[PDB]
Ligand binder design. Structure first.
Ligand SMILES: CCCCCCCCCCCCCCCCCC(=O)OC[C@H](COP(=O)([O-])OCC(O)COP(=O)([O-])OC[C@@H](COC(=O)CCCCCCCCCCCCCCCCC)OC(=O)CCCCCCCCCCCCCCCCC)OC(=O)CCCCCCCCCCCCCCCCC
Ligand SMILES: CC(C)=CCC/C(C)=C/CC/C(C)=C/CC/C(C)=C/CC/C(C)=C/CC/C(C)=C/CC/C(C)=C/CC/C(C)=C/CC/C(C)=C/CC1=C(C)C(=O)c2ccccc2C1=O
Ligand SMILES: CC(C)=CCC/C(C)=C\CC/C(C)=C/CC/C(C)=C/CC/C(C)=C/CC/C(C)=C/CC/C(C)=C/CC/C(C)=C/CC/C(C)=C\CC1=C(C)C(=O)c2ccccc2C1=O
Ligand SMILES: CCCCCCCCCCCCCCCC(=O)O[C@H](COC(=O)CCCCCCC[C@@H](C)CCCCCCCCC)COP(=O)(O)O[C@H]1[C@H](O)[C@H](O)[C@H](O)[C@@H](O)[C@@H]1O
Ligand SMILES: CCCCCCCCCCCCCCCC(=O)O[C@H](COC(=O)CCCCCCC[C@@H](C)CCCCCCCCC)COP(=O)(O)O[C@H]1[C@H](O)[C@H](O)[C@H](O)[C@@H](O)[C@@H]1O
Ligand code: HEM
Ligand code: HEM
Ligand code: HEM
Ligand SMILES: CCCCCCCCCCCCCCCC(=O)OC[C@H](C)OC(=O)CCCCCCCC[C@@H](C)CCCCCCCC
Ligand SMILES: CCc1nc2ccc(Cl)cn2c1C(=O)NCc1ccc(N2CCC(c3ccc(OC(F)(F)F)cc3)CC2)cc1
Ligand SMILES: CCc1nc2ccc(Cl)cn2c1C(=O)NCc1ccc(N2CCC(c3ccc(OC(F)(F)F)cc3)CC2)cc1
Ligand code: FES
Ligand code: FES
Lengths: 535, 382, 382, 53, 53
């Protein structure tokens, strides 16, 4: 009697507790059903996967630099001195059933975490989702991205490895010891001594399994709490205003689709972990300070930093008995990047003077200057990231390595400018496309007029039509416009039988009539809600 | 405008749902079943399709269970029969697991998009400036807590509490951090001229006066005799060799006492050096630094492998162009001229190790790097 | 009864506090200032006392900072001058830190017991069975979500979802755990009678037939020759020595190949044995174990140190009573009679190692334990 | 030494004693016999990350 | 968290070669060596782990 059992359990919960009001309020919360709003969820989902994978890897990983010979199953690295951390990473890959799969999906989930954070940041920025309520959520979100990048760095830096070891040597050692006032002091505090200090990997393990994951979890909790209680913003639309949320309630629809999306994303991650090989550390010999490879790259989310260093024109300064190594620059540059990311919304509201409480997103085209700025920033990031690959790009795509370096050097100033101009003009052109759709309407097939040879596009008005043919022009309302008669009720009644065979004409007629009436009822409900809201 | 004390008894599920939406300000507009026409076989097709996706997820999960339980996993040495089976062990694990959960998710999405009724629920957003009653009550509560506590009248407690918290926090943060803070310039490494800080020394720093530091090649033998003496004829014209500061005391790696001196040499971040035999025809193109005009033993030039910019090894060597390339950030130093950076981020030349040959003809350092050999830091070039 | 739209402007701080308490169901009864009489010097002195506690906390925090920065910490070898200063370095750190924070807390408690107004606020407890409207509305919402979703009507979809979720969960849990699961009875330890599972073997299992496993004593020398062959004369009547299975191949720890075999011997859980020389006068009292009647070489008896209960070493040995005592759980075995537990949790006798003397008169095991030697487990005594 | 003998008694001995899966649980927890080389890292993970969480 | 910045969990055998004389050249797991280092080598480490326990 599952119904009786459920009723009894609910009565017990509501007698011990009194959450009916809260449960109902969270079950009725409305979340807009725009696809872009799922982007952030990806990161969260991927984050969860990382945790679930990370725990599994903590039961098999031994952080240390204790020198040991492998004496394991992997023949190509046998009798070779290496850290216990590398030995246990190899054992996970080979000696633990599914360990290679688990760590590959862990790395793929780290990459997806980074990429989805980056795409979510692109959405929030271009849509102005950070503009007044939610400016903090942008700051706490920008601090999540930085922590995620550093977390991934400490993660692939965790299994002491040739590639990851040289990455540590470059970034953590050189840049840290280049900082003028306290560079050497910071380096010695971090490594407890010189670069290969015997305390590095255990400390990175502590930072990467507990500390930084804990900070990220707390910040994600704050982020989701703010999104939940600062009702999620929405795009302009028919029934959508600054003072409401149009979408679906949590329980029946939003929760099921969010869970299904989590399942699909973890399926993608598992498929990648199986079919795609990520970080084959067994090929990456144990870290030796005298050994290095040509590739020598970090994960994509950090490559931009490396790219910066590659493209920065080897500028140093030599004060009285001291030197500021060129590496310092990237740190400063890094600071600037984060300094300009965390503190963007405030700069936007300082320049534009726009501190109003904005709950309606704005299309990227509707804000040409910010869209151009974001395109310019993305262009600079892509230039830096591909500069970090200039070795591989030159190898595969035959371009002289010096040519690639100088292309990046000139580009990091020119390409952002070209992209800004192009994106500004593109946003304005998209605005003009929308305006001309409103003025004239959608476009269709061409007709030759009866008396004369005039050819007319045979437009289709979206609103009231004037006494003559041309329609009253509609006023832009901040929402996408239909640029194809495709997407209206035109040529959209295929056979409902099956892919192979028909259904009886009566059943097809009933189904199509029901769907047609349902679309009318939806559109009508939106229209009456609009009219009641305004008037 | 009444809480429906007794009307709730006869209210239907729809009525109570609407009442809840009204309480929360959530209006469900256009909640309609996805299959208003009953008995249509399109509904049956859709239901079978959703169940098919779920069944595919389940079959894939069962396949994951079976393949994980019963499959030839385990590393198989190269060339051994059954290696192919291993090579697609993890691929099958991921394939089956991902396919199972992805198909379950697809079935759930299809159920949402085809059976769960479509709704356009609209909610009342009350963002910003809580009603003035709540703001006034909160402000009154906080101000009563502050002023009533009599603070800002007890200036002595006001100042003493702040001083106590400041002193305690200073001491506590100091206690946290002082464990980590280490002086980079504590003289720890012994040297012929007394103990020196780590960054001033490498494996080539003479621990004793007239110490014979051989440029030992790093033969990658598994554990025993990893470093071997080296002789000038070993490197031919246009050849590069990575060499290390091996001592007579640091014998082969058989003994437990050894095998750690050698491991220390190997792990010496600044220890590795690259010895390059400049082609004789190219010796007229060589340019020398101040104080390094004799660091080369004939046509043998020893330059630190550690790149002067961020300290990656500069391993790559290009003969017929004499360019030492660092792969981390693609910096080229000119080997003919003193190893000065002719391209890339690096701005300081690689430190040249003095070299010569002792009795028996073995190559041996003729001294230490006249400058520190790693990437530059604040306390450098003085 | 009304939200007080404009009256809030005229409401005082106390009135607004009362209104907020009313909204939350919190009635503040008897909120009064702690010092109703102004100008009294008792108030001034309590002010001074709280400030004194806070300033004591501040001075203690400053002392913590000063002692942490400037105090002769660092281990000092026993007997060295300045060892006394170290011995109370950590005590001083803790003393100063604790006094600081404790005095700050004391000052805060005294402030709230002396100056913060005393309240007997009483709150409305609405716990249990939220009003009927909320309960029925929640029920309607959830039931509409369930039934409207059309589940419990597509039996195929529900059954397929259940099967898929169950299969995927089984596969995923198996994938998680199978990494951990290791067959304890996989034959891994090589033995003269073929590879055997670990628990069936120890360092005393003959790796090859006729292998000479010496009862080597563990001299605690730093690394070199930690194990040396042993002779019967060394143990004197009423004397116990811990011995280990030292092979000829497991030479001294001078080389790298050795010093790891010896580490394996030392870290072998079941490797350690205790050799006890029964006094001749007590010889007639010895009671033997069937199948172990000749295990003793004259008056020398080798019994495993590992307790037969939970596998702690049974190191303690009492002569003149011949009691092998285990201190983990205070279990007493009779050494005279076969090492059977005569007190404590242990219920199985310690395994007796066969012993004899080989060529040159050195004590060598005369064979392996006739039974497994660690603590008992399910697959034992068959 | 104290904590090591405590591990030996409690974890090893008691887990090995459990009738059906005791030896299996012991070999899973230690990845082998008692002195297994993956015990302390596993306890570290359980103690700084998992159990505190 | 503080202790996690100085503790290396492992059974990798190592000789102490540290400050505490009564354990020098004695084989110990890296975990024990780092516990000794926290007690003796890092300022306040004895105090921190003592207050932790
Ligand atoms: C971690 C990784 C993943 C991240 C997960 C985070 C998810 C966040 C989503 C938020 C959802 C939420 O909080 O729901 C609670 C939410 C409470 O809020 P509410 O119901 O609207 O109450 C009125 C408002 O809170 C009144 O507030 P308001 O809406 O008028 O505006 C005030 C608002 C202001 O908005 C904010 O500033 C929110 C952001 C706060 C910043 C930091 C929050 C958390 C940061 C810490 C990180 C955690 C990790 O402050 C808050 O409400 C904060 C609430 C604190 C919870 C934060 C959640 C985390 O609803 C519930 O309580 C529903 C659940 C009911 C539980 C009982 C059910 C059965 C009882 C039996 C239990 C045991 C049975 C055993 C047998
Ligand atoms: C720092 C900096 C920007 C340096 C400049 C060097 C640079 C980026 C050059 C561009 C690379 C190209 C496009 C080379 C082709 C020749 C060329 C330049 C033609 C003219 C370019 C042009 C404007 C043509 C008009 C039409 C057009 C846009 C053509 C583009 C053709 C291409 C390559 C399109 C795809 C873009 C693309 C994927 C470029 C490579 C980017 C990367 C980082 C790939 C990484 C990658 C590599 C490198 C693998 O080896 C690999 C092996 C196995 C599996 C996966 C991979 C993998 O993902
Ligand atoms: C060899 C080996 C070890 C292999 C294993 C690989 C490994 C190590 C790890 C991965 C293995 C596993 C366990 C994979 C499956 C993970 C998992 C639990 C998937 C569940 C998904 C699934 C099967 C769904 C079935 C379809 C279905 C009926 C869905 C509806 C019911 C469900 C499951 C609802 C779940 C809802 C959900 C995802 C809640 C997440 C909870 C959290 C952290 C946040 C919730 C939340 C979300 C999701 C928002 O989007 C949001 C947006 C704006 C403001 C606030 C929020 C918010 O609070
Ligand atoms: C307001 C704070 C006032 C304190 C200023 C702090 C710095 C002053 C140092 C001046 C005295 C120097 C001589 C005595 C000291 C000395 O000789 O040591 C030096 C290193 O100074 C130390 O002692 C530890 C320094 C204490 C941590 C200071 C943290 C920075 C402060 C500024 C931040 C917190 C204050 C609150 C402000 C922030 C508020 C937040 C909003 C070098 O180390 P070394 O010679 O290798 O010995 C190592 C042993 O120290 C080492 O503890 C041990 O770990 C071993 O590793 C050992 O090697
Ligand atoms: C409902 C699940 C239905 C499946 C039942 C699972 C048990 C069936 C075992 C059948 C396989 C036996 C023959 C082939 C396989 C074989 O011989 O392996 C054995 C060990 O079996 C393994 O494969 C790993 C066992 C898989 C984990 C099973 C965990 C127990 C299940 C019952 C709990 C989760 C299921 C969901 C129920 C709970 C629902 C919650 C509501 C012995 O290890 P070994 O010979 O040393 O090899 C070692 C490699 O296995 C090892 O992965 C590797 O790590 C190395 O250890 C290697 O040494
Ligand atoms: C671990 C990193 C992050 C996680 C887990 C995360 C997660 C989420 C989720 C699930 C949402 C609601 C869904 C959506 O609106 O797309 C959201 C909204 C938001 N995110 Fe993040 N995000 C992360 C990083 C960032 C970054 C890098 C920024 C910049 C940012 C700023 C915002 C803002 C302002 C919102 C509110 C947008 C709105 O109300 O629609 N977050 N975040
Ligand atoms: C929060 C975001 C996280 C990111 C971006 C991240 C990223 C990474 C990456 C890319 C690796 C490289 C692994 C490899 O290449 O094999 C790694 C390693 C590792 N991660 Fe994380 N991780 C995160 C969270 C966690 C958590 C929460 C845990 C533990 C609960 C964890 C435990 C580990 C362990 C033990 C390793 C080393 C295992 C190995 O490499 O074999 N990680 N991490
Ligand atoms: C939550 C309850 C906790 C309890 C009851 C607990 C208990 C203990 C105890 C008694 C010790 C022995 C320390 C010694 O004898 O020196 C210890 C060691 C340790 N604890 Fe925990 N702990 C807890 C949480 C944590 C957390 C959250 C962390 C990390 C953030 C942590 C990290 C450590 C480390 C690294 C050690 C070994 C370091 C050392 O012994 O010096 N503990 N723990
Ligand atoms: C990381 C931030 C980097 C900030 C460096 C602060 C420089 C402090 C030391 C300057 C110095 O006196 O040392 C001697 C110097 C080598 O002599 C020369 O200046 C000859 C070069 C002529 C060209 C000058 C270019 C100046 C550019 C700066 C204005 C821009 C900095 C941003
Ligand atoms: C270097 C490029 C590179 N080449 C290769 C080659 C091969 C491989 Cl595999 C990887 N790479 C990489 C690489 O991955 N680079 C990532 C990277 C870069 C910089 C930092 N830095 C953070 C700030 C620190 C810092 C500075 C100032 C501070 O001051 C404050 F904030 F006020 F406290 C605090 C911290 C210095 C290090 C980290 C990772
Ligand atoms: C032994 C006493 C003792 N003597 C000394 C001497 C010296 C020192 Cl220093 C310390 N001691 C201690 C000691 O500290 N004892 C603490 C202790 C004991 C038992 C366990 N147990 C966990 C569960 C296991 C278990 C049980 C059931 C299971 O089945 C399930 F749950 F269904 F999976 C699985 C595992 C048995 C061990 C932990 C800590
Ligand atoms: S690390 Fe050598 S050029 Fe940058
Ligand atoms: S541990 Fe020996 S009596 Fe229990």
């Amino acid at each position: 009697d599952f119904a009786k059992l459920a009723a009894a359990q609910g009565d017990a919960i509501d007698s011990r507790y009194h959450p009916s009001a809260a449960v109902r309020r969270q079950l009725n919360k409305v979340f807009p059903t725009h696809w872009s709003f799922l982007l952030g969820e990806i990161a969260l989902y991927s984050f969860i996967i990382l945790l679930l994978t990370g725990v599994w890897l903590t039961l098999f990983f031994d952080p240390s630099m204790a020198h040991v010979t492998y004496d394991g199953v992997y023949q190509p690295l046998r009798g070779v001195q290496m850290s216990r951390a590398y030995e246990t990473a190899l054992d996970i890959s080979f000696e633990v059933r599914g360990g290679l799969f688990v760590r590959q999906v862990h790395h793929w989930a780290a990459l997806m975490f980074a990429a989805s954070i980056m795409v979510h940041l692109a959405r929030i920025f271009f849509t102005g989702a950070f503009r007044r309520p939610r400016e903090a959520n942008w700051v706490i979100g920008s601090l999540l991205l930085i922590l995620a990048m550093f977390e991934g760095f400490f993660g692939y830096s965790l299994p002491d490895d040739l590639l990851s070891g040289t990455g540590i040597r470059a970034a953590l050692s050189g840049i840290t010891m280049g900082i003028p006032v306290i560079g050497t002091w910071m380096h010695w505090a971090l490594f407890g001594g010189d670069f290969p200090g015997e305390i590095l990997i255990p400390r990175l393990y502590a930072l990467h399994i507990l500390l930084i994951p804990g900070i990220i979890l707390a910040l994600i909790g704050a982020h989701l709490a703010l999104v939940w209680f600062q009702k999620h913003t929405q795009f302009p639309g028919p029934g959508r205003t600054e003072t409401n949320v149009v979408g679906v309630r949590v329980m029946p629809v939003f929760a099921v689709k969010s869970g299904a999306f989590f399942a699909m994303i973890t399926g993608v991650l598992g498929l990648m972990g199986g079919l795609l090989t990520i970080n084959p550390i067994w090929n990456l010999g144990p870290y030796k300070p005298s050994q290095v490879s040509a590739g020598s790259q970090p994960d994509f989310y950090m490559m931009w930093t490396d790219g910066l260093i590659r493209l920065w024109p080897a500028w140093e300064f030599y004060p009285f008995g001291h030197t500021i190594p060129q590496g310092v620059w990237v740190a400063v540059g890094m600071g600037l990047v984060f300094a300009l990311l965390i503190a963007y919304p405030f700069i936007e509201k300082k320049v534009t003077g726009d501190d109003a409480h904005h709950n309606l997103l704005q299309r990227p085209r509707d804000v040409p200057v910010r869209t151009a700025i974001g395109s310019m920033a993305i262009a600079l990031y892509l230039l830096l990231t591909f500069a970090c690959m200039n070795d591989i790009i030159a190898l595969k795509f035959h371009i002289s390595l010096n040519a690639t370096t100088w292309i990046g050097r000139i580009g990091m100033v020119v390409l952002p400018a070209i992209v800004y101009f192009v994106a500004y003009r593109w946003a304005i052109s998209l605005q003009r496309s929308d305006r001309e759709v409103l003025e004239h309407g959608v476009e269709t097939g061409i007709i030759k007029r009866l008396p004369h040879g005039a050819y007319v596009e045979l437009h289709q008005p979206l609103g009231p039509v004037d006494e003559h043919g041309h329609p009253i022009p509609l006023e832009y309302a901040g929402a996408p416009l239909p640029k194809r008669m495709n997407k209206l009720g035109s040529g959209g009644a295929p056979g409902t039988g099956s892919f192979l065979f028909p259904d009886p004409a009566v059943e097809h007629e009933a189904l199509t009539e029901a769907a047609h009436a349902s679309e009318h009822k939806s559109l009508t409900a939106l229209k009456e809600h609009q009219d009641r809201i305004h008037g | 405008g009444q809480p429906t004390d007794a009307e709730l008894a006869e209210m239907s599920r729809e009525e109570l749902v609407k009442l809840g939406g009204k309480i929360d300000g959530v209006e469900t507009i256009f909640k309609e079943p996805r299959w208003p026409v009953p008995g249509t076989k399109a509904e049956k097709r859709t239901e079978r399709l959703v169940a098919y996706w779920l069944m595919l997820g389940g079959l894939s999960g069962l396949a994951l269970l079976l393949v994980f339980l019963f499959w030839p996993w385990e590393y198989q040495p190269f060339g051994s029969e059954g290696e192919f089976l291993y090579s697609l062990a993890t691929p099958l694990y991921g394939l089956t697991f991902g396919l199972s959960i992805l198909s379950i998710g697809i079935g759930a999405v299809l159920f949402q998009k085809k059976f769960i009724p479509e709704e356009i629920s609209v909610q009342d957003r009350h963002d910003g400036r809580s009603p003035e009653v709540h703001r006034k009550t909160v402000a009154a509560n906080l101000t009563d807590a502050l002023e009533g506590s009599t603070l800002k009248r007890r200036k002595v407690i006001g100042l003493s509490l702040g001083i106590g918290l400041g002193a305690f926090g200073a001491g506590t943060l100091v206690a946290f951090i002082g464990g980590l803070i280490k002086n980079p310039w504590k003289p720890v490494v012994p040297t012929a001229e007394g103990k020196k800080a780590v960054l001033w020394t490498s494996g080539w720093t003479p621990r004793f006066k007239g110490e014979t530091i051989y440029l030992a090649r790093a033969t990658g033998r598994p554990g025993e005799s990893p470093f071997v003496k080296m002789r000038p004829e070993d490197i031919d014209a246009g050849g590069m060799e990575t060499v290390f500061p091996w001592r007579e005391s640091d014998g082969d790696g058989t003994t437990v006492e050894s095998e750690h001196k050698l491991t220390e040499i190997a792990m010496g971040v600044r220890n590795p050096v690259m010895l390059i035999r400049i082609k004789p025809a190219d010796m007229h193109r060589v340019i020398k630094r101040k104080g390094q005009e004799s660091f080369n033993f004939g046509e043998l030039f020893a330059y630190t492998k550690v790149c002067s910019h961020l300290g990656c090894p500069s391993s790559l060597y290009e003969q017929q162009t004499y360019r030492i390339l660092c792969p981390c950030h693609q910096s080229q130093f000119d080997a003919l001229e003193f190893a000065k950076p002719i391209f890339g981020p690096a701005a300081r030349a690689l430190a040249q190790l003095p070299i010569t040959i002792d009795e028996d003809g073995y190559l041996v350092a003729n001294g230490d790097f006249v400058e520190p050999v790693g990437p530059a830091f604040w306390e450098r070039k003085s």
